[PDB]
Amino acid sequence: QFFTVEENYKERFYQLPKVFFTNPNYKDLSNDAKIAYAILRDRLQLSIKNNWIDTEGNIYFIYTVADLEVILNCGNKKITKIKKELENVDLLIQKRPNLLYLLKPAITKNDIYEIDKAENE
Amino acid sequence: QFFTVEENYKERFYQLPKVFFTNPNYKDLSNDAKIAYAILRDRLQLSIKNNWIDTEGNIYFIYTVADLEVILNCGNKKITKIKKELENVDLLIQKRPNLLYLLKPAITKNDIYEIDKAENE
Amino acid sequence: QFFTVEENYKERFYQLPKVFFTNPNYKDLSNDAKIAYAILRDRLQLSIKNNWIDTEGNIYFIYTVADLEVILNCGNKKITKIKKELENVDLLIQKRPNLLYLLKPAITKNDIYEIDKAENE
Amino acid sequence: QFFTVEENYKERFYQLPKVFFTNPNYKDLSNDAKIAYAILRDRLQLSIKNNWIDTEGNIYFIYTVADLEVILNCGNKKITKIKKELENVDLLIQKRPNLLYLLKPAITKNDIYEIDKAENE
Numbered sequence A, B, C, D: 001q002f003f004t005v006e007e008n009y010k011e012r013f014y015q016l017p018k019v020f021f022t023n024p025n026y027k028d029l030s031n032d033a034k035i036a037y038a039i040l041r042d043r044l045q046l047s048i049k050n051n052w053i054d055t056e057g058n059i060y061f062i063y064t065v066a067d068l069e070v071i072l073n074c075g076n077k078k079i080t081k082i083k084k085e086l087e088n089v090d091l092l093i094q095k096r097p098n099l100l101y102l103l104k105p106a107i108t109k110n111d112i113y114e115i116d117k118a119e120n121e
Helices: A007-008 A031-041 A043-047 A067-072 A076-088 A109-117 B005-010 B030-039 B046-048 B064-070 B076-088 B109-119 C006-011 C030-040 C043-051 C065-071 C076-088 C107-121 D005-010 D029-042 D044-049 D067-073 D078-088 D109-119
Strands: A013-017 A093-096 A100-102 B013-017 B092-094 B100-102 C011-019 C092-094 C100-102 D013-017 D092-094 D100-102
Touching: A007 B046, A007 D109, A013 A031, A013 A093, A013 D029, A031 A076, A031 A100, A031 D013, A031 D029, A043 C076, A067 A076, A076 A093, A109 B100, A109 C011, A109 D005, B013 B030, B013 C030, B013 D092, B030 B076, B030 B100, B030 C030, B030 C107, B046 C076, B046 D005, B064 B076, B076 B092, B109 C006, C006 D044, C011 C030, C030 C100, C043 D005, C065 D067, D029 D078, D067 D078
Parallel strands: none
Antiparallel strands: A013 D013, A093 A100, B013 C011, B092 B100, C092 C100, D092 D100
């Protein structure tokens, strides 16, 4: 009944939006981009610490081609595909030392319906 | 659809074990101790950073009477009641610069049954 | 390394907004109301199932004096104090078979600052 | 400040173990299997409802080739690769109307170290 450092690290997860698997806009995405989104999402709290917050309170990223390279553990060929994929679906904004804005996904009445079916018997 | 620092801080919660509200051992506890447990639980990740990990990997706390005083925002009269309450139910171990070990709660077939009833219509 | 039903019920928590412990508007609240908020918050998913969703997509509650009585495990004397307390701080709306609207808390630059101090060394 | 059904479905995630991206045993896994693990993990609560709990309290799955086919949205060719991949790393047990046991991942001192580096600046 002790809290262990091992059980603690075993309970750390990246968060994959379930809508990535019901919404036609998103389902299309390569798993590399879906997972990339989840990994970047986890960094939001960091950005707040790095004070990467704009004038309106929006949280952004300042990552080079190499940063994302280590962060997502993939080559610049792949990350190029990743960014382009996420932007095409309005999941990312590169408002050009680049600035990246992660965006939350959209939800539709159908997503809801589907997400229910996906979460039940 | 931007992630905001405000929405981010608005989505930060202390975790209250639901079993604190079904198990007779725990229900008895004062809300001050239940909440105190939740607050301390949130500190586990800190302790790992402070390398407050024993030889077997268990995570502990090194908090003075004043630390807990600010951490739980209450007087030493109350925290005394808090510790004694949590220890009485094996939710805390003071293995005497004090060392505190938070413990996870117990679960019984009835807790499960009750927790189901509590989570449903 | 098996997932057990016991470990699963042991990892179920009510979510206590941390801002309830930094914002002056909220700190004032009795622990009964803070916890009551957390308990009710957990019911949101139920309401969606009961189709307790208004025209604008807002999620509400249809609970009698007895429902809340069992749900929060307390007497009608206490729940009266609870509702009045939560409404006074805009955490609840009783738009009178009653309808209850839970509301999310507010966040201020100070809450953020405080919440940082509360989450760190 | 209302809780909306849309914001509620927008905040639903599958949980990707971060160790899948630090431990050599796991990193190797195809994204299809990593995500498949996350999707199946989400079903644990269902299994409890279906009373898919063995004598020792372990939670299991009773899924046909078609069930997993719809659940993971992929062909039987892919799921074959998925199961074989997860079993090879002790993340799944097919104790043959099949029975599937999801297993939690392992953690090492290095995983911890890596997971820290992955979660920080």
